[PDB]
């Protein structure tokens, strides 16, 4: 009766321990061993934020936590989950290898990112179906994205919610909410990736369910390449508005991931921080959704549509 679904659970990876973000880094660089400088720069931020293993077992829990709530909520299908990961072990290839010996015939595979790029189509589920139609007799089905979804709407405006309602409506009145994702190099606007476009729409529905008077949109954690990427940064964004519009309160909501790993400790509750203590600024970044069973429910409901469409 059970229909075996096969379910690839897909995101970046992150070192488990020290001795990781060397490897992890090269495997990020195409092959490319980093420099010590580069080196100790990394392992630097690392033990800024406190440590390089809380942020491994953020990943995993997502994925098992899902799994088993799938099985729950349903009689109709088995959902098997499996883990393929970037740029650290288990790796995407070997998690649709094992996918293809337990004799799964088709898979849902989501990633761990709410919108729709090309960078992530590529990285992940264009990845995957190239094992799947190297070994034969498995079939792939890639969600595009899942910013739409009203339970990942409603986890973010409760969020937000939260926050603004233990400011003083004076400094509600001085507060803006700043919406952000993982740049990417420009050239993806011009070939016709709505990346952007789906982070300004999932900025008007916090905004609007959270009723939220002042927000803006803004990138972090560009690349370094010759290429421009696209702004603006969070760090520059937070000087202009508090220039010509004179916010002294920025409300972090870092709605293109979905977990507190480097890039929101750091890049967000380091980097940004220093920005709002320079212009006498109050800094607040709300709880990642990790690994909570609101978000859970929210990527159940996801998998569910999807299985829908799908048959």
Same mark, same amino acid.
Request: net charge negative; glycine share 6%.
């Given at each position: 009766?059970?229909?075996?679904?096969?379910?690839?659970?897909?995101?970046?990876?992150?070192?488990?321990?020290?001795?990781?973000?060397?490897?992890?880094?090269?495997?990020?660089? +195409?092959?490319?061993?980093?420099?010590?400088?580069?080196?100790?720069? #990394?392992? %630097?931020?690392?033990? /800024?934020? !406190?440590?390089?293993?809380?942020?491994?077992?953020?990943?995993?829990?997502?994925?098992?936590?899902?799994?088993?709530?799938?099985?729950?909520?349903?009689?109709?299908?088995?959902?098997?989950?499996?883990?393929?990961?970037?740029?650290?072990?288990?790796?995407?290839?070997?998690?649709?290898?094992?996918?293809?010996?337990?004799?799964?015939?088709?898979?849902?595979?989501?990633?761990?990112?709410?919108?729709?790029?090309?960078?992530?189509?590529?990285?992940?589920?264009?990845?995957?179906?190239?094992?799947?139609?190297?070994?034969?007799?498995?079939?792939?089905?890639?969600?595009?994205?899942?910013?739409?979804?009203?339970?990942?709407?409603?986890?973010?405006?409760?969020?937000?919610?939260?926050?603004?309602?233990?400011?003083?409506?004076?400094? +509600?009145?001085?507060?803006?909410?700043?919406?952000?994702?993982?740049? #990417?190099? %420009?050239?993806?606007? /011009?070939? !016709?990736?709505?990346?952007?476009?789906?982070?300004?729409?999932?900025?008007?529905?916090?905004?609007?369910?959270?009723?939220?008077?002042?927000?803006?949109?803004?990138?972090?954690?560009?690349?370094?390449?010759?290429?421009?990427?696209?702004?603006?940064?969070?760090?520059?964004?937070?000087?202009?508005?508090?220039?010509?519009?004179?916010?002294?309160?920025?409300?972090?909501?870092?709605?293109?991931?979905?977990?507190?790993?480097?890039?929101?400790?750091?890049?967000?509750?380091?980097?940004?921080?220093?920005?709002?203590?320079?212009?006498?600024?109050?800094?607040?970044?709300?709880?990642?959704?990790?690994?909570?069973?609101?978000?859970?429910?929210?990527?159940?409901?996801?998998?569910?549509?999807?299985?829908?469409?799908?048959?």
């Amino acid at each position: 009766m059970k229909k075996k679904i096969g379910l690839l659970v897909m995101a970046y990876g992150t070192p488990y321990k020290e001795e990781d973000i060397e490897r992890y880094y090269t495997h990020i660089r +195409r092959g490319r061993k980093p420099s010590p400088e580069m080196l100790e720069d #990394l392992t %630097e931020r690392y033990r /800024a934020i !406190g440590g390089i293993s809380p942020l491994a077992t953020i990943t995993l829990e997502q994925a098992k936590k899902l799994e088993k709530r799938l099985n729950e909520v349903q009689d109709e299908v088995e959902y098997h989950m499996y883990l393929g990961l970037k740029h650290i072990e288990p790796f995407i290839e070997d998690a649709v290898k094992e996918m293809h010996n337990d004799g799964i015939q088709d898979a849902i595979a989501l990633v761990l990112a709410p919108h729709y790029s090309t960078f992530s189509v590529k990285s992940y589920v264009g990845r995957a179906q190239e094992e799947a139609e190297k070994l034969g007799n498995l079939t792939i089905h890639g969600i595009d994205s899942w910013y739409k979804e009203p339970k990942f709407i409603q986890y973010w405006v409760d969020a937000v919610k939260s926050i603004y309602s233990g400011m003083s409506d004076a400094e +509600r009145e001085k507060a803006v909410l700043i919406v952000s994702a993982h740049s #990417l190099p %420009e050239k993806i606007i /011009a070939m !016709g990736d709505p990346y952007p476009d789906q982070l300004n729409e999932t900025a008007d529905y916090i905004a609007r369910g959270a009723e939220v008077a002042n927000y803006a949109v803004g990138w972090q954690s560009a690349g370094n390449t010759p290429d421009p990427w696209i702004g603006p940064d969070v760090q520059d964004l937070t000087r202009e508005l508090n220039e010509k519009y004179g916010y002294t309160s920025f409300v972090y909501a870092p709605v293109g991931f979905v977990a507190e790993h480097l890039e929101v400790l750091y890049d967000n509750d380091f980097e940004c921080k220093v920005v709002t203590d320079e212009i006498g600024a109050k800094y607040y970044r709300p709880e990642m959704p990790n690994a909570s069973d609101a978000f859970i429910d929210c990527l159940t409901d996801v998998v569910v549509k999807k299985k829908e469409s799908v048959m």
